[PDB]
Design a protein around this ligand. Structure first.
Ligand SMILES: Nc1ncnc2c1ncn2[C@@H]1O[C@H](COP(=O)(O)OP(=O)(O)O)[C@@H](O)[C@H]1O
Ligand SMILES: Nc1ncnc2c1ncn2[C@@H]1O[C@H](COP(=O)(O)OP(=O)(O)O)[C@@H](O)[C@H]1O
Ligand SMILES: Nc1ncnc2c1ncn2[C@@H]1O[C@H](COP(=O)(O)OP(=O)(O)O)[C@@H](O)[C@H]1O
Ligand SMILES: [Mg+2]
Ligand SMILES: [Mg+2]
Lengths: 529, 44, 521, 89
């Protein structure tokens, strides 16, 4: 036979191994397929009835979770459009911390709906303008649906009831206990000023009994061992040092030079006396426990044991700062007896054992303190990691509630209302953007559809009933999970709420990602290396 | 030999008859090699 | 097709088939340790890549030695490790229970049933079972100082029944109880020494209330000093006693031969000053973590005193805790209160080795085991068996609630759950019934290992437990059933409380997985 | 569901196993072989063994412990008998 040689010009001047895609048929319709498949991959982990997923990364490490961001991070994607969707999801996670699956579902639905408009004749620009107009209208509509704003962020029961939902979406059954624990931990460290740092909540995992044996502690725990003979203090005055607990030396090279024998016989005695004097000077101020960030010497340990001083060595360069914040002391860069202002105070300092683990505990009775710790007990590291992720989401929800006080109903009610109102608006717009607006409105049913499919009912009946009940003026009606027959329930009475800011940012980022994917026309790829 | 192996690959064992045969053959060969150099009229 | 989503080499599997595959793999994992349960259970031999062999009857050890790489199977290893770390006994029962749960709920999963219903039923059943166990446990508020010892002895003897040292359980239980009651309030495990010396018979194993450790390296002259003291004083040091440079940072610059000679004499003067400071305190035994030189050894031997160097840190700490001194880094303040005291010190020949014994201290807070045997793995398995009793005794000292063994508690829980299930309607009834049926794998496995007719014995046990005999289990020697509470087959309630929670948590986690994705390399 | 060959143990296809009475019989055969080798060196009329080292060195001996120490074996039961002899010694 014969061959089709090549086309003159760029097709001949292209490098070997490179790829050049152009046109609607070779670029847009393939990007839409890639994004749709990526969305379908994680569709099944959405809602309270979502199923866990097991992923092994390239280092043979095992992950079990239903968090969309973790799944996307552990997967490795080779397609640029899915890469941009992934970056949109990661940006949403960084900005708010919850709603990383809503972004994927919305973007996939928007693209798969724009495909048929492109098929029936509309160009990319008319789709883009319609999407932008619809997004602005949705952002304008959203505030009117706000209901049941937060009242007191220093009431334990109200905080637990506000944080229940975001935990219940991942741990179905343990949500009450987890909400109680996280509410206690968050209310403990919340200052008078609005400033609430997420980093001030620490999580410690100990293998052992079941999840129900988890606890919260007003202080700090370290998985270390006491370096001295003393093991417990009942009213602790703490000194903190950043330098090693040893006699210092010159930065420049030094050498002990001796020309007689008396110096040789006296050097070590003088050194030992100097160290003893320094240690006793430190001990005279009343310090019970000395914390150091570096090496300890044998002679220093001997004298510390002689004078009944508890010696703890912790070494992260950040745990030291956290301990300083917890107790109220300032790290000293030189070995000198501290002044009272530099001296920390903690009630109890001791060494304990939990489930084959030696820990050192600094504990207060104060309900406020500066930071707090959550001790998790589980039978599997994967389970403990999943509970840690749930705790992180709860903390992020509390911080978002601190930033903004407004809530909106959940379980599909907000999406159904937005879709109905956007359809009503887009009915009255003359032109070729009404099709894009109607498609944008229709894309909102994907969330209740996914919830119904995961629950195991008929999504069409659920959506029809939601529309029928919303036509009468009931704006707080959403999907019911408990019933085996498709049904609806009032969400405001049931307490299924979610934050306004999260929905705002999710819609914004999803729309931006979708239009950015739609704007690309032709693709040039170099050969992989 | 038993069907079960009680040795590493390359290890060897010789029992009564074979051991006696090998030892006697070696000793007699050593003696016969040096017999020729005995006496006032031995050779080099 | 032109550009693919994920990297080539990715493997994915979803739906009912992969769940069924996970259930199947858990069955193999449970079959790996099935025949090591009960007083008539055997043990296994594992050979690694380097040819080193391990003979074991411990479920956690066997599972660790197996090289399991199945993601669903790894959970059964994890729960066994968790149980071993938490209570120290019951590593096989939890794996068997988890596998039984999964096998029992397999067909309902195959029928298309939603896994969350199964998870809810499991959680309800686990809570009910734990509550019932806590209700029916047996405790004595103010029993005695001597009725607090028979309980521990019975618990230890029950814990030692299925191990290699089963014949000498009455001999070993007394020693483990003594070792635990001679131990502080924190009950630290490092305060108990275990030594293994080849030769001799098992009945030659001994417990020394004091300390004993192996002979260390010695220089010339060590044979010229005495080897038995009655009322000595012991100095514990962290100082190096030999002729050496003062500091590696040092340097000596000198002009005259007289000063040279003085410099030479100064080092001997320093060393002899330290030695005389040690000598004048009255100490007769000297122990150090740092090398003891030949000059120091000959100095001590010329004055009838004993010296030992390079003593391990753990042994020195145990010696200090037994005698009542303190480690000294400086010999300039050797007072009486820093010197240890013992009622006799000796050096003895044990099975080809030389050992130093400090015995007679009444204020001791530690003890040491000397274990004899015929092989390295023999002694290793003996130590593994002793650890199981030690942990059980510690937990029993903490809380003193016990229940009868041999399957009585499992039969009672199964009867309770079966009675409860008839009250509720729907698929919850079927799932709770399956959970209740899954609990009687333990008596069945006991009878299977012993070589009985398991079906008839199970029928008799069920018939007895319903007529009204809460504590009725299988009798291995009598081929029949018997009241296990009057036969002194006891165990703390924690072992079953922790086993149920651990097994239920692993069953729920495996069921709630939808698909598995593997990344390249 | 088609439970096709699924991988549980690392290097699954190159490891072996033995269960039941067959393992016990193999152990008994190995022990019998070792004992029958050691039988003839018992008593005032017993004979002795010649052992050749890895480097070609020769040792003529009657001591059971030394013979079993100088023999190199693969069978774990044989190694157990060697350790038993060494412990007695
Ligand atoms: N009890 C409930 N009933 C109905 N819907 C719920 C309930 N709890 C949470 N949801 C819904 O689950 C949806 C998604 O939450 P989730 O599955 O955690 O993924 P993400 O929050 O990352 O989007 C939310 O929109 C919320 O409305
Ligand atoms: N004397 C005995 N008579 C009957 N059953 C016993 C006896 N001793 C122990 N058992 C049973 O053996 C089981 C313990 O199994 P074992 O192999 O020792 O390790 P594990 O405790 O990890 O299962 C317990 O369930 C107990 O009921
Ligand atoms: N003169 C003798 N008469 C009878 N029996 C003997 C005599 N000498 C040794 N034996 C027996 O030979 C047996 C084996 O001893 P030996 O061959 O020296 O090796 P081992 O002592 O290591 O078994 C001993 O049990 C001993 O009773
Ligand atoms: Mg969420
Ligand atoms: Mg056991």
């Amino acid at each position: 036979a014969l061959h089709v040689p090549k086309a003159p010009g760029f097709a001949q001047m292209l490098k070997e191994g490179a790829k050049h895609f152009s046109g609607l048929e070779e670029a847009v319709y393939r990007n839409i397929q890639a994004c749709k498949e990526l969305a379908q991959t994680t569709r099944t982990a959405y809602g309270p009835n979502g199923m866990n997923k097991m992923v092994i990364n390239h280092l043979e490490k095992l992950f079990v979770t239903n968090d969309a961001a973790t799944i996307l991070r552990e997967l490795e994607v080779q397609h640029p459009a899915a890469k941009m969707i992934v970056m949109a999801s990661h940006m949403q996670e960084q900005e708010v911390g919850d709603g990383t699956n809503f972004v994927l579902v919305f973007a996939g639905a928007l693209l798969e709906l724009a495909e048929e408009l492109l098929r029936i004749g509309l160009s990319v620009s008319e789709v883009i303008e319609g999407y932008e107009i619809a997004c602005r209208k949705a952002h304008e509509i959203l505030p009117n649906l706000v209901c049941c704003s937060a009242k007191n962020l220093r009431d334990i029961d109200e905080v637990s009831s506000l944080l229940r939902t975001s935990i219940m979406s991942k741990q179905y059954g343990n949500e009450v206990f987890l909400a109680k624990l996280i509410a206690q931990a968050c209310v403990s460290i919340f200052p008078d000023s609005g400033h609430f740092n997420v980093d001030n909540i620490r999580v410690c995992k100990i293998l052992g009994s079941g999840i129900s044996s988890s606890s919260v502690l007003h202080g700090m725990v370290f998985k270390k061992e006491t370096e001295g003979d003393v093991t417990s203090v009942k009213d602790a005055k703490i000194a903190v040092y950043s330098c090693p607990f040893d006699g210092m030396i010159t930065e420049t090279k030094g050498t002990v030079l001796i020309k007689t024998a008396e110096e040789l016989m006296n050097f070590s005695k003088g050194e030992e006396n100097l160290m003893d004097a320094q240690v006793k000077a430190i001990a005279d101020t009343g310090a019970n426990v000395v914390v150091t960030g570096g090496k300890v010497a044998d002679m220093a340990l001997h004298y510390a044991n002689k004078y009944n001083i508890m010696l703890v060595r912790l070494n992260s360069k950040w745990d030291l700062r956290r301990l300083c914040k917890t107790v109220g002391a300032t790290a000293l860069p030189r070995l000198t007896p501290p002044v009272l202002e530099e001296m920390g105070h903690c009630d109890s300092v001791y060494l304990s054992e939990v489930g084959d683990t030696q820990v050192v505990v600094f504990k207060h009775e104060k309900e406020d303190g500066a930071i707090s710790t959550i001790v998790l007990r589980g039978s599997t590291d994967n389970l403990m990691d999943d509970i840690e992720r749930a705790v992180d989401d709860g903390v992020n929800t509390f911080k978002v509630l601190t930033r903004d006080k407004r809530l909106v109903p959940g379980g599909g009610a907000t999406e159904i209302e937005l879709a109905k109102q956007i359809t009503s608006y887009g009915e009255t717009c003359p032109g070729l953007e009404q099709y894009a607006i109607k498609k944008f409105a229709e894309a909102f049913e994907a969330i209740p559809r996914a919830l119904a499919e995961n629950s195991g009912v008929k999504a069409n009946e659920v959506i029809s009933k939601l529309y029928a009940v919303h036509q009468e003026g009931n704006k707080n009606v959403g999907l019911d999970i408990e019933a085996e027959v498709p049904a609806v329930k009032d969400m405001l009475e049931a307490g299924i709420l979610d934050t306004y800011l999260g929905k705002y940012w999710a819609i914004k980022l999803a729309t931006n990602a979708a239009v950015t994917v739609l704007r690309v026309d032709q693709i040039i790829m170099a050969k992989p290396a | 030999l038993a069907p079960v192996n009680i040795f590493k690959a390359g290890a060897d064992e010789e029992r009564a008859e074979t051991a006696r045969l090998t030892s006697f053959i070696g000793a007699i060969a050593i003696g016969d090699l040096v017999k020729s150099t005995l006496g006032p009229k031995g050779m080099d | 097709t032109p550009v693919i989503l994920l990297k080539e080499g990715t493997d994915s599997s979803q739906g009912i088939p992969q769940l069924v595959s996970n259930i199947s793999a858990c069955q193999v994992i449970a079959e790996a340790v099935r025949t090591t349960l009960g007083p008539r259970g055997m043990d296994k031999l594992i050979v690694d890549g380097r040819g080193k062999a391990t003979i074991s009857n411990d479920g956690a050890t066997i599972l660790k030695l197996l090289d399991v790489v199945h993601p669903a199977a790894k959970t059964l290893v994890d729960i066994a490790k968790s149980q071993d770390a938490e209570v120290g006994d019951g590593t096989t029962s939890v794996t068997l229970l988890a596998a039984e749960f999964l096998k029992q709920v397999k067909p309902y999963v195959e029928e298309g049933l939603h896994p969350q219903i199964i998870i809810r039923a499991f959680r309800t059943a686990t809570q009910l079972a734990v509550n019932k166990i806590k209700e029916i446990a047996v405790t004595v508020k103010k029993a005695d100082k001597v009725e607090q010892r028979k309980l521990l002895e019975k618990c230890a003897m029950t814990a030692l029944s299925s191990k290699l040292i089963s014949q000498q359980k009455a001999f070993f239980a007394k020693m483990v109880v003594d070792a635990v009651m001679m131990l502080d309030d924190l009950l630290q495990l490092k305060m108990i020494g275990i030594k293994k010396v080849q030769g001799g018979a098992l009945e030659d194993s001994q417990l020394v209330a004091g300390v004993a450790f192996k002979k260390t390296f010695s220089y010339a002259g060590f044979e010229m000093q005495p080897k038995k003291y009655h009322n000595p004083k012991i100095a514990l040091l962290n100082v190096e006693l030999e002729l050496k440079a003062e500091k590696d940072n040092a340097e000596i610059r000198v002009h005259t031969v007289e000063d040279y000679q003085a410099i030479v004499d100064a080092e001997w003067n320093i060393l002899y000053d330290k030695l005389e400071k040690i000598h004048h305190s009255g100490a007769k035994v000297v122990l150090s973590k740092l090398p003891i030189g030949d000059v120091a050894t000959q100095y001590f031997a010329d004055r009838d005193m004993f010296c030992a160097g390079r003593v391990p840190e753990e042994d020195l700490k145990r010696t200090m805790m037994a005698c009542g001194g303190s480690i000294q880094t400086s010999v300039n303040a050797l007072s009486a209160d820093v010197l240890g005291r013992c009622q006799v010190f000796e050096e003895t020949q044990i099975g080809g080795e030389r050992y130093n014994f400090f015995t007679g201290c009444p204020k001791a807070k530690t003890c040491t085991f000397i274990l004899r045997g015929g092989a390295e793995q023999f002694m290793e398995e003996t130590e593994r068996s002793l650890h199981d009793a030690i942990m059980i005794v510690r937990r029993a000292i903490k809380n003193d609630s016990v229940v009868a063994g041999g399957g009585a508690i499992e039969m009672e829980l199964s009867k309770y759950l079966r009675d409860y299930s008839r009250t509720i309607p729907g698929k919850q009834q079927l799932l709770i019934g399956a959970y209740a049926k899954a609990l009687e794998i333990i008596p069945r496995q006991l009878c299977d290992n012993a070589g009985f007719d398991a079906t008839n014995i199970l029928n008799k046990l069920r018939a007895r437990h319903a007529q009204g005999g809460t504590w009725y289990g299988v009798d291995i020697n009598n081929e029949d059933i018997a009241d296990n509470f009057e036969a002194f087959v006891w165990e703390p309630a924690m072992v079953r409380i922790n086993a149920l929670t651990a097994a239920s948590e692993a069953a729920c986690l495996i069921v709630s997985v939808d698909e598995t994705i593997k990344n390249p390399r | 569901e088609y439970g096709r060959p699924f991988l549980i143990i690392k290097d699954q296809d190159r490891k072996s196993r033995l269960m039941g009475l067959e393992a016990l019989k193999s152990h008994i055969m190995a022990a019998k072989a070792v004992a029958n080798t050691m039988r003839t060196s018992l008593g005032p009329n017993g004979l002795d063994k010649m052992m050749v080292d890895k480097d070609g060195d020769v040792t003529v001996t009657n001591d059971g412990a030394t013979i079993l120490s100088m023999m190199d074996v693969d069978h774990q039961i044989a190694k157990l008998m060697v350790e038993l002899s060494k412990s007695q010694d």
